[PDB]
Design a protein around this ligand. Sequence first.
Ligand SMILES: Cc1cc(OCCCS(C)(=O)=O)cc(C)c1-c1cccc(COc2ccc3c(c2)OC[C@H]3CC(=O)O)c1
Lengths: 234, 58, 271, 232, 337
Amino acid sequence: LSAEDKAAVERSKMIDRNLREDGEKARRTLRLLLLGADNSGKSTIVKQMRILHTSGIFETKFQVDKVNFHMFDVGGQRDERRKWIQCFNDVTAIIFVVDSSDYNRLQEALNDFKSIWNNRWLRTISVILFLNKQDLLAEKVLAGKSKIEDYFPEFARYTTPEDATPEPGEDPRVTRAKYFIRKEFVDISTASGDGRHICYPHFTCAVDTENARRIFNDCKDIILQMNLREYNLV
Amino acid sequence: TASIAQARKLVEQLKMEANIDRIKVSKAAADLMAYCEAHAKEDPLLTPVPASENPFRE
Amino acid sequence: DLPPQLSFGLYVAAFALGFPLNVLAIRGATAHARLRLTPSLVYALNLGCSDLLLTVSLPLKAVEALASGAWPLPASLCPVFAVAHFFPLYAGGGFLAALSAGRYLGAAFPLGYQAFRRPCYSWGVCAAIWALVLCHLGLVFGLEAPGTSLGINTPVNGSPVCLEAWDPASAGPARFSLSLLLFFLPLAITAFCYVGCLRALARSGLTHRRKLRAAWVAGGALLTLLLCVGPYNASNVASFLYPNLGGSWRKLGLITGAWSVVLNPLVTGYL
Amino acid sequence: DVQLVESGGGLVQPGGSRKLSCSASGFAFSSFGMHWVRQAPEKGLEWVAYISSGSGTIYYADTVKGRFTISRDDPKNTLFLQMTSLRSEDTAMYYCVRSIYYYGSSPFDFWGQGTTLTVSDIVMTQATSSVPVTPGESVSISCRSSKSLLHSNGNTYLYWFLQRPGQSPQLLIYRMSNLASGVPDRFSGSGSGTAFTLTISRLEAEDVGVYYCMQHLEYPLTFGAGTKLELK
Amino acid sequence: LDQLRQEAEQLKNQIRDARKACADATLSQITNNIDPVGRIQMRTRRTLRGHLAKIYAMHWGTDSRLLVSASQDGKLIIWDSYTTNKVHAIPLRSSWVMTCAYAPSGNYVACGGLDNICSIYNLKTREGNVRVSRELAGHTGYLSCCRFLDDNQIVTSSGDTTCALWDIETGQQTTTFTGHTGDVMSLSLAPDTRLFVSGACDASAKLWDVREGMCRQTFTGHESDINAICFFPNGNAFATGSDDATCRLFDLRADQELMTYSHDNIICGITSVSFSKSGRLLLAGYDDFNCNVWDALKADRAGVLAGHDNRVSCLGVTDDGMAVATGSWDSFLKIWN
Ligand SMILES: Cc1cc(OCCCS(C)(=O)=O)cc(C)c1-c1cccc(COc2ccc3c(c2)OC[C@H]3CC(=O)O)c1
């Protein structure tokens, strides 16, 4: 080598040093992909709001227990998502939000969840399911104007399981409807995936302010299960 | 106006494919062969280059 | 009771069973490690290395037992066989303790674990326990040799023996302290890490069947530490506590170690 | 608006000590290696010291080795030269030079103003020290090296610098035949691996000055005597 | 309504009749006379190990050196391929980058992605650091490809089914090319930079005239998304690869599919496609972690690269012809010849 070649090698080494420092700093934090149809409050899941990198896709940053989550929402396009989704096959989790209040589009949401769950590139990514607007669901089921059986005949033959635990002292019909709705999604999830990735259903409302804690806990569980996979306990 | 626009587009497609009808597939294949054989001795991947001037030596 | 044919048969069978499955386990471990490196792979590779070393040292003491104590090979090779047999026991104990600690850290502090999960740290810990056990063996063996050759002793009108007839009064405290600091501390570490891993698996439910399967795998590691090397270290401490006790328990403990060499790749090896 | 302003020059007693500073502005200072270059009051250029990018490598000239220190402060974008045991031969102008090194870089692209100081190897040979010349005509300046400057990689390291009267030097050809940025195209460089010629096609009034050829194959870095072109 | 559908229906039938009439002898029968290229053994000479995330694009410089590459770690890297030196490292505003291009003059690099913005960075500045010369105006979809016509003109393809031609100086869309049906995934410039082809998610390719901005020709025959496209070195043909695990060589003049490259043992999709200097070797990267080298005329697997641990994403042959560089999702670039 000459003097210039040596200086070029030194500059390359400095570039490598900066690259590794940036890489570890980035590897520190956790990354989530937010999905769900409109009129589902997908942007209201976490109370904190942000306009980070508002151009193109939407960024959000929230910190819980001194660990940072970056949530990416690709909301620019309403068309087919089958192409860019492969860029997200390394995120910690997919936060899928479904508005359970309306029964007209619920089958469409189930089909979307089936498409996401059985995706070729997301076959190892866990899904955190958020059943939004449960209060509207309760109001609709209590009013009685609209019935599940108009769209789901099996709800006539469905009964609440013995393990059902309605905690806030709610109406049993509300719990029955909620558990059937969640059962549809968990049935979609369980039919495939053979335990490589699992779904974590939850119930939430618009005024709820504890969704960050649930996201953090289920992310901890996902990390734990990957760790146990690394040591080959699973 | 999407339908009429696509109709005009397909008319343009016919006009362009007029020369396609003029050209022959066998002629095109012969041209591909001619180019490949004409430049066959200048690509190292086809004909491996001696290690003297190959810049990626070890 | 010491039937030389029986001991010879157990040692020969132990070697013959261990060698194929052990090399298969190390081949599987290296095939997995080719794609990527994880601390579990590092620990498994070191466990396999120690197991191969012990199983290649086994036939020598099998022959020695067939000679009922006498070593047909001349006493110039005593320290080589001594290290190559009695080092891998404590080496495997330490390796299993480190593996259990890694499992506990991964299952109890998962975010923190992937925050600072590097195979370099695993290699450093492995080399540290390598050096510690070699150093402790060296210092304990420095006060063994009277300077007859080093590490060998001959009874009156008797054949040379590899520490088999070593002075019990001198060998008591040394063997006891070594066995304690090289086995019981790893045993306590393994037990605490196992109960922590069980707590984490319980509170981090994913599926009952898989929870049981993971608990059984970790328990297999703990038992292969406890069921085989445990008898050896227990016999050692018992001999320290009871100097007049008979010496057949030492032979039983060495048999249990010879069964450790075959049991270890079964419940911890990748394949 | 790249700018390098140095300070510290003054009258000192022999064997004294002094500190020269150079503030840099208008560019990414931390990404540039930096050089201190001496020019004797009546002689040519002479390299003094070199601090690398990130301070990884430090090189000194033999005549100032040990008693000279070169240092860098990135946060203030500043360069320091600590001078101890000053001598009569250390009275010079002490230019500060910028440099960067990657595949297609042009080192020694920018030069400082310098600060006059006064107190109380491969050889570069320039055949001529002065050439009378008239504007509008071609001219050629040749210099020679003791050892062939062509490295095995195919790059030969010779640099051409033009110093107009009362001005800091500037780079013209940063390799065998590589025109520097901002230099008019009428300049060119050519020659073999040991003898190198700078060619100018047309001459104007601003081309009057001293021309130096420099080697960069290996340290230390050595300059030529300098060919002076004066209008006629 | 259906009144104009019949008009378009007959036009589609007529042009197919033209294509069948144009074809008498298939390419394979014509090339049956020549002798095969034989087995091609290609070895790895360099491995570039700076990227900390999966790599989506790379582009060779015109000097057969100094390649550029882009990955999700939020970094562009300009490598000196001869010495594996890292010439430049450029931070990106948005880490979701799907393409990168190298200016033929060597003064600029362009990258874009899920942010809908095609940024152009200046490499040769007086300040000594690479700066964002221009963030181009907005598409209505992600950027899938971009290529430099010159130091002032660029051509981009987006997920809004539309390609565009931009003037860098003004920063505006000089031309907007007509619509595809699905996403536009690939883009290749003709050697003379007069025409260019695009491949879409509607399993169709389109040949465009740059100066007039109107789709000259349309080619079909695939069964899934077209992921990669590349002209023949003489500019009279181009090859595409699709998720249906097949490559097609179409010819512009005959306006008809010429050859198909497929094997029953290959089922994964094709991510990248490129030619050799003479066009006889067609190099294609696949999803099953290895590339294939086909004899472009006889249409058989003349070789396999088989050196990557993950999905092969980008692939490019140098202009000089020495080497081929492949970048994969394992955050590695490998140079072969
Ligand atoms: C210390 C030494 C010296 C040595 O000299 C070689 C000749 C050089 S000259 C003539 O100048 O002396 C050669 C070797 C190999 C070694 C050695 C190095 C590392 C470990 C061990 C084993 O240490 C043990 C082996 C078994 C046992 C030890 C120690 O404790 C007793 C029982 C274990 C048990 O029975 O439970 C030897």
